[PDB]
């Protein structure tokens, strides 16, 4: 009944218009689960996604080989397998591959089947995905990290500036607050002549505009709205700031200063990718009052995570599904971090209409989600609205409790 | 079994982050149909989303519509839609809201399709629904913010399938970015009015494609927004002779709102090109049956842009599509500024419409393209891409 009867994949497009894999898992019950994998990519020591390299189709970005790995290899191995056994399924996919970075079948083919199987099974038990995945205690709505301003790589003259509606009584209220501030920040930028807005800018100017946008929308900094930053220090690191004309210990000094002036609750990649020495020093200085998130620093790798847990290098990790390659290994990484860091479930640049991360964040009661501006790549914000509604009296918005501060 | 048991609405966000209505219809079979209907019933409460809230349309669904339709057979689309029209009792669906009526109308069709275990295009169109549309892919912009002409679209007419045609357009979209670098939706760089066309023509041949034979241009100059003052410096009969010149030099297959909202004399004059070009009425027809029938007898255009949200119901939309089609015109189904809903992909195949205007290949737009890919695959051998057969010349 929850036994797999068919596995089929197809080449669809992502939010950037690039090919991506969509997997359908059909059970003996008639239930079909469908998953779209965020694509992205021939580099780095992490789970690798299979791209075609046929330059006569989508400039080599095709995904027909990952499609073939699903339609032939995975289908032949997994037809008759019980889809309700998530862990066993995932270890059957990992073993069928045989490579430590999912390079033979593709991390995109493995994740697609892993996610589609979970959805098929959820629909067979007649359960929503968050409940099927996390059981009876899945009820916490995350505080979103809402992108309102861009920079660095996307600037003309620190990469991301986000707002977090901590003070909201529900996700529905929190989303509205953030949407109202986003719309107000458009006016604030326009009446000064300049996912989120990326204009020519000091490094203090974006924080000032955001403070004005929070205030003019009618919200209280600190109490209601807080700032989460992703300067992406790996992008500006041969030992570090062109916008300020200056050149690891001194970078910490800049962050302590800024955190004391602005209501910054979280800082992601505040120090570079392999600057393990500096990361530990940043925790001793800010860790007690600021969330320090490892993105390029931890690359959702459990070995790097355990090293940073032991070294006391951060207190939060950014979780990316496509970097791990299976649902079981993602849940394992979320749990490892949580048992006392925060796990921040994040979307990808090459995302889709697929809303799995909205259910995954509630299933694990993660407390925080990292999505873009409230402007469809939105579907995730709508899923969280549907989940909060469905949970009724049982729903709880994380709020301040989202933070291990 | 297909009898309605519950009708539920909620306020969600649209692709612009504006509140919109999402309606769920539940049948006695346990099947649920869900639809998102973006707005152009608006709240006007300034202490919520700066008055753009849709709580009143949500209340119209959860109370008025739910009480009146619980127990109604969802499989009877026409009767359900005339029950909605009668409950509202206003010519422009102003009591309950067009968004409230469309939401229930679409969600009821989806609930019923799922109860019969049928994909929406087959449930809506029957056994002959199989024609994949030629997309009007927006690759270049102008006019306003989100040259004098608002939209520049490519059409992969020469493709053997929708899958192939989608790849062509996507490749040309990416190639045009590399050409703009060497000088909402499509690229909008400030610029001669012939330059966008020459840039598009360069991107076509640089991607490895042939104009006319494989790729054709479709235009939405939206001349109604400039009423003709082409502030090129120029200042109706001349405008007609201007488009004649373009068609002669460039592979333009279609022209939308080539003349003003109410320039009926000129619309009927452009006889001048009606024979070699598709002339689309957007602001000129505003999807109204009364105005559409007027332009049919007048021979003022040979195509109508279909906006589901402007019509308000599924039955009235199919009615408007059929009227245009059976009078020799093409019906071009179009998107809106505001969601993840992919109904128009199933609606375009259900009616074998041959063309879709759903924007740049970049989730609100991509989701519709993905639905068309799933539809083509599901049809298998039965599928047919319209190609040149999409056009009435
Ligand atoms: Mg990051
Ligand atoms: Mg138009």
Q: Whole-angstrom Cα distance, residue B260 to residue B270?
A: 12
Q: Are B362 and B187 in contact (CB under 8 A)?
A: no
Q: Whole-angstrom Cα distance, residue A253 to residue A238?
A: 19
CA distance B113 to chain A (A): 16
- Across the interface, whether the CB atoms of A12 and B373 are under 8 A apart is answered yes
**A354 shares contact with chain B (CB less than 8 Å):** no
Shortest CA distance from A353: residue in chain B: B363
Return the CA Rg of chain B: 21
Q: Read off the tokens for B266.
A: 């000129």
Render B240-287 in DSSP notation, one character per residue: HHHHHHHHHHS-EEEEES-S-TT-HHHHHH---STTTSEEEESTTTTT
User: Which helix (DSSP H) or strand (DSSP E) does residue A133 occupy?
Assistant: helix A129-134
Q: What is the DSSP letter of A72?
A: I
- Across the interface, whether the CB atoms of A382 and B12 are under 8 A apart is answered yes
Q: Considering B56, B307, B316, B368, which one is annotated as catalytic?
A: B307
Q: Whole-angstrom Cα distance, residue B315 to residue B212?
A: 36
Q: Whole-angstrom Cα distance, residue A368 to residue A140?
A: 9
Place of tokens 């000094």: A253
Q: How far is the CA of B222 from the centre of ligand 2 (A)?
A: 6
Q: Are A178 and A196 in contact (CB under 8 A)?
A: no
Return the CA Rg of chain A: 21
In terms of DSSP bridges, do strands B303-306 and A368-371 run parallel, antiparallel, or are they unpaired? unpaired
- Across the interface, whether the CB atoms of B17 and A375 are under 8 A apart is answered yes
**B168 shares contact with chain A (CB less than 8 Å):** no
Residue A132 backbone dihedrals phi, psi, to 5 degrees: -60, -40
Q: Considering B5, B11, B83, B184, which one is annotated as catalytic?
A: B184
- Across the interface, whether the CB atoms of B361 and A13 are under 8 A apart is answered yes
User: Which helix (DSSP H) or strand (DSSP E) does residue B6 occupy?
Assistant: strand B4-13
CB proximity list for B117: less than 8 A, separation 6 or greater: none
Alpha-carbon torsion, ordered B310, B312, B313, B317, to 10 deg: -10
Strands (E), A122-169: 140-141, 143-150, 160-164
CA B312 vs CA B27, B56, B91, B101: distances in Å: 22, 17, 11, 6
* A36 contacts on B by Cβ (under 8 Å): 370
Task: Estimate to the nearest angstrom the gap between the alpha carbon of B323 and the chain centroid.
Answer: 17
A104 burial level (CB within 10 Å; 0-12, 13-18, 19+):
middle
Q: Whole-angstrom Cα distance, residue A260 to residue B258?
A: 58
**B6 shares contact with chain A (CB less than 8 Å):** no
- Across the interface, whether the CB atoms of A14 and B366 are under 8 A apart is answered yes
In terms of DSSP bridges, do strands B19-27 and B4-13 run parallel, antiparallel, or are they unpaired? antiparallel
Residues ending a continuous segment of chain A before a break (C–N > 2.5 Å): 40, 157, 194, 201, 237, 239, 240, 247, 339, 375, 377
Task: Identify the structural domains of chain B with CATH numbers, from first to last.
Answer: 3-117 (3.30.390.10), 118-393 (3.20.20.120)
Residue A3 backbone dihedrals phi, psi, to 5 degrees: -75, 130
Binding-site members of A for Mg(2+) are 41, 230, 268, 295
**A376 shares contact with chain B (CB less than 8 Å):** yes
Q: Are B252 and B216 in contact (CB under 8 A)?
A: yes
Experimental technique behind these coordinates: X-ray
A340 burial level (CB within 10 Å; 0-12, 13-18, 19+):
exposed
Q: Read off the tokens for B75.
A: 């499989």
End-to-end CA distance of chain A: 46
Q: Considering A65, A102, A119, A320, which one is annotated as catalytic?
A: A320
Q: Whole-angstrom Cα distance, residue B358 to residue B367?
A: 10
Smallest CA-to-CA distance from A323 within A350, A342, A341, A358 is with: A350
The Cβ of residue B9 has, within 10 Å, a number of other Cβ atoms equal to 28
CA A317 vs CA A266, A295, A307, A308, B64: distances in Å: 11, 6, 12, 10, 48
* A352 contacts on B by Cβ (under 8 Å): 363, 366-367
Place of tokens 């068609």: B247
Is B307 designated active site? Answer: yes
**B206 shares contact with chain A (CB less than 8 Å):** no
Q: Which ligand is nearest to the CA of B334?
A: 2
CB proximity list for A367: less than 8 A, separation 6 or greater: A140, A142, A143, A342, A398, A401, A402, A403
Q: Read off the tokens for B36.
A: 């998102």
Outline where A153-275 has alpha helix (H).
Answer: 171-190, 205-216, 249-261
Strands (E), B137-258: 137-141, 151-155, 216-220, 252-256
Among B167, B170, B363, the residue with its CB nearest the CB of A379 is B363
Dihedral-angle region of residue B241 (phi above 0 means left; psi in -120 to 50 means alpha; beta otherwise) = alpha
Q: Read off the tokens for A102.
A: 């999912």
């Amino acid at each position: 009944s929850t036994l797999i009867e068919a596995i089929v994949a197809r080449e669809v497009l992502d939010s950037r218009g690039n090919p991506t894999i969509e997997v359908d898992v059909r059970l003996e019950s008639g239930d079909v689960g469908r998953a779209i994998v965020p694509s992205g990519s021939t580099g780095a020591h992490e789970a690798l996604e299979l791209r075609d390299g046929d330059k006569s189709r989508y400039n080599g970005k095709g995904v027909l080989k990952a499609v073939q790995a699903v339609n032939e290899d995975i289908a032949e191995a997994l037809i008759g397998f019980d889809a309700a056994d998530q862990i066993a399924l995932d270890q059957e996919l990992i073993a069928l591959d045989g490579t430590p970075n999912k390079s033979k079948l593709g991390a995109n083919a493995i994740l697609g089947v892993s996610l589609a199987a979970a959805k098929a099974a959820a629909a067979a038990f007649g359960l929503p995905l968050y409940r099927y995945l996390g059981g009876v205690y899945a009820h916490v709505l995350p505080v979103p990290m809402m992108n309102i301003m861009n920079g660095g790589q996307h600037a003309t003259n620190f990469q991301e500036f986000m707002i977090m509606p901590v003070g909201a009584e529900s996700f529905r209220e929190g989303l509205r607050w953030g949407a109202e501030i986003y719309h107000m920040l458009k006016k604030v930028i326009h009446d000064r002549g300049f996912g989120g807005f990326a204009p020519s800018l000091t490094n203090d100017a974006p924080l000032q505009l955001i403070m004005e946008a929070i205030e003019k929308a009618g919200y209280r900094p600190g109490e209601q709205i807080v700032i989460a930053l992703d300067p992406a220090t790996t992008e500006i690191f041969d030992g570090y700031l062109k916008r300020e004309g200056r050149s690891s210990a001194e970078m910490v000094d800049y962050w302590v200063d800024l955190v004391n002036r602005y209501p910054i609750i979280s800082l992601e990649d505040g120090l570079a990718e392999d600057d393990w020495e500096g990361w530990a020093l940043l925790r001793a200085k800010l860790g007690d009052r600021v969330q320090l998130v490892g993105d390029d620093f931890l690359v959702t790798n459990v070995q790097r995570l355990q090293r940073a847990i032991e070294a006391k290098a951060a207190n939060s990790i950014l979780i990316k599904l496509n970097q791990i390659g299976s649902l079981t290994e993602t849940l394992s990484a979320i749990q490892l971090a949580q048992r006392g860091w925060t796990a921040v479930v994040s979307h990808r640049s090459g995302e889709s209409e697929d809303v799995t991360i909205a259910d995954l964040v509630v299933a694990t009661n993660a407390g925080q989600i990292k999505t873009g501006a409230p402007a469809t790549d939105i579907a995730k914000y709508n899923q969280l609205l549907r989940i909060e509604e469905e949970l009724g009296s049982a729903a709880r918005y994380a709020g301040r409790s989202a933070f291990k501060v």
